[PDB]
Paper text:
Recently, T = 4 capsids have been observed when overexpressing the covalently-linked CP dimers in ssRNA phages PP7 and MS2. Here, we have observed under normal wild-type phage infection, T = 4 capsids are also made, albeit a small percentage (0.5%) of the overall number of particles. The elongated faces of the small prolate consist of two triangulation numbers, Q1 = 2 and Q2 = 3. Figure 3A shows the five forms of the VLPs from the wild-type Qβ, each containing 240, 210, 180, 150, and 132 CP copies for the T = 4, prolate, T = 3, oblate, and small prolate forms, respectively. Though all of the 5 forms contain 12 copies of the pentamers, they consist of 30, 25, 20, 15, and 12 copies of the hexamers for the T = 4, prolate, T = 3, oblate, and small prolate forms, respectively. For the T = 3 and T = 4 VLPs, both are formed by only one type of hexamer. The T = 4 capsid has one type of hexamer with a θ angle of ~170°, defined as a “less arched” type.
The coat proteins (CPs) of single-stranded RNA bacteriophages (ssRNA phages) directly assemble around the genomic RNA (gRNA) to form a near-icosahedral capsid with a single maturation protein (Mat) that binds the gRNA and interacts with the retractile pilus during infection of the host. The canonical ssRNA phage Qβ has a genomic RNA (gRNA) of 4217 nucleotides, from the 5′ to the 3′ end, encoding the maturation protein (Mat); the major coat protein (CP); the minor capsid protein A1, which is a read-through extension caused by a leaky stop codon for the major CP; and the β-subunit of the RNA-dependent RNA replicase (Rep). Like many other viruses, the CPs of ssRNA phages can also assemble into virus-like particles (VLPs), which are not infectious. Through a native infection without engineering the amino acid sequences, we found that Qβ CP can form diverse VLP capsids, including the T = 3 icosahedral, T = 4 icosahedral, prolate, oblate, and a small prolate form elongated along the 3-fold axis.
Author numbering:
A (entry chain B), B (entry chain A), C (entry chain B), D (entry chain A), E (entry chain C), F (entry chain D): 1 to 132
């Protein structure tokens, strides 16, 4: 996953928007990759970062974690710089056995995408209805 | 949200498998739909569970939570022992406030579908080649 | 009361408005039904929910409770998303004996509607005058 | 509010009964009108009481409270014993702030009159068939 | 397993009666679902109650249960409630180990319904006559 | 009243299979009518046993006890003689008072068969789907 700029799309309710994730770098002090759209004023921007966690003396498994930050930045007309008055997010953790293969890990990755793209979760997220 | 049979296509590293979930009833303590996999034993494998919390606690926010359970077998016995041994799994939480826009929630959802289609996230999971 | 969408009307001071209550679902963790108009941004919306309480080892009777939420959502022109700066409500509890019949329960239900629709309460609610 | 004789028509499961209340005086401790039912003994049955609180406590809000008392008899004795035994009742509170709009208060009131006319609330009370 | 309205038929001594079971939801502290009868008075109802339990450690097995059914109502010399005595009861549970087949489960369910219909039990139960 | 061979058709998931119980006399330990499946191995696996008792001094209630056993044997890798690994069964009882008669017994056993055949129990048992 050697970082490179990737444009993501089919975004939003209609699946029409795109976003661009430009690597900013990888933070060596915590094992976290970071890419963003824009970035002139980071507080106001959408960001995606990924942690890397390997098996260890105190870790039974390894992880890939994606942190998704989606702020809403507002200012009233007549004023200056906007500020974030909402922070929307997602927190995606993948966790796997050291004896697991690519196909099995991929099932979890693609099951997630296929299911989040399915009505059960589309409604759980857009309508926020109780499972029912 | 509303539960109905879910068919998930284009699954796995090849993008060729199909999974079928059966959301047949919601847990009274956790608000969790049991998305059983099709097949009496396979149902326990590749199982997913889903709950949508309400802003009923002093956080004043809510979370849509999907838990993906993918334990797998290693060589079942003639005694009808499934030999389930190893496991892959994921925890994905969304992680919004009460004033959030449905469109923004949709972006977060579709952005993840897009991230799961990108080498920046895929290589780190299927080939376990992290960001750099 | 198998939930279905119902339009309510003769609403407001003149008895002219209507509202639509679309089931969102029933929360199995607390026995509470929920329906609303709209819902894209739940904090800002009118909602009606109903609890169900049955006789028990620690309950002498059974109840039907209706919770009515009527927020006032405001933003100033030139800004963004409105927020609620008023929460108006009603809390309606019905409670009955296990030996009571439908007619008796209906008397309480229709007595309430007939009386809330009568000047004694119309003025108690719109004018907020002391009983006098 | 202002008290005068109240006639409530279209009462009961059939919508055919008429009740008559007599709001003849307000309780000095609770601010409660005694809406006596017509008839010296029937007055005690199907009795309703009403009070409008003022924002005189550190809540800075107020409540219109109506209490419906519908105890009923089972087979009076020749000794002139009314045999009142079983009871149906309701407590309805409105539950507004000092800055509320009269129109919004009217909506809450009329919305309840409308809810009491809907199967979503009726079936749960008259047939005791709750939401689902 | 959505606990929606259930209609039964072809029942009673001559197989000619019908019954609609109207669910009232599930007890939050007891996994058993309950379904209401057509009677107006709760104290007189013959409620159907149902549960599916799926244990892990402590039992490592599965259980499904239904509770049946009715107290007998009557009056004599004047009353208050036409009161009921439990007279007609049955209790059916299903039990099996983990990882069972759906066909195995189906046979136990269908075998019982067939056994109940069969003369050896349908007449033996009516008469309470041991089969020898 | 009499012991007889039982043929049960239209059973199993598809409602098409037939099971046959060969009579096996009486067990005078408990007054149990023992019947078992008509085959060399089913004789060892699959069986139904039944007893009926009048009230004991500790009941004032008649009892019917039906035990349905449908275990599955598996052949371990090294066995010649397969044995039961999955002991599936059902526990079926009835209880009636000393003043109950034919209709009380009839609606219970016929309502039970109707319940077993209902879509709620078909799904609750065959799939093990909780009624939520």
């Amino acid at each position: 996953a050697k970082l490179e700029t990737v444009t993501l799309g089919n975004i939003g309710k209609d699946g029409k928007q795109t976003l661009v994730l430009n690597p900013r770098g990888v933070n060596p002090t915590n094992g976290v990759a970071s890419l963003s759209q824009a970035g002139a004023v980071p507080a106001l921007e959408k960001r995606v970062t990924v942690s890397v966690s390997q098996p260890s003396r105190n870790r039974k498994n390894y992880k890939v974690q994606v942190k998704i930050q989606n702020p809403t930045a507002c200012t009233a007309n007549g004023s200056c710089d906007p500020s974030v008055t909402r922070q929307a997010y997602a927190d995606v953790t993948f966790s796997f056995t050291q004896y697991s293969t690519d196909e099995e890990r991929a099932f979890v990755r693609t099951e997630l995408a296929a299911l989040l793209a399915s009505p059960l979760l589309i409604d759980a997220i857009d309508q926020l209805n109780p499972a029912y």
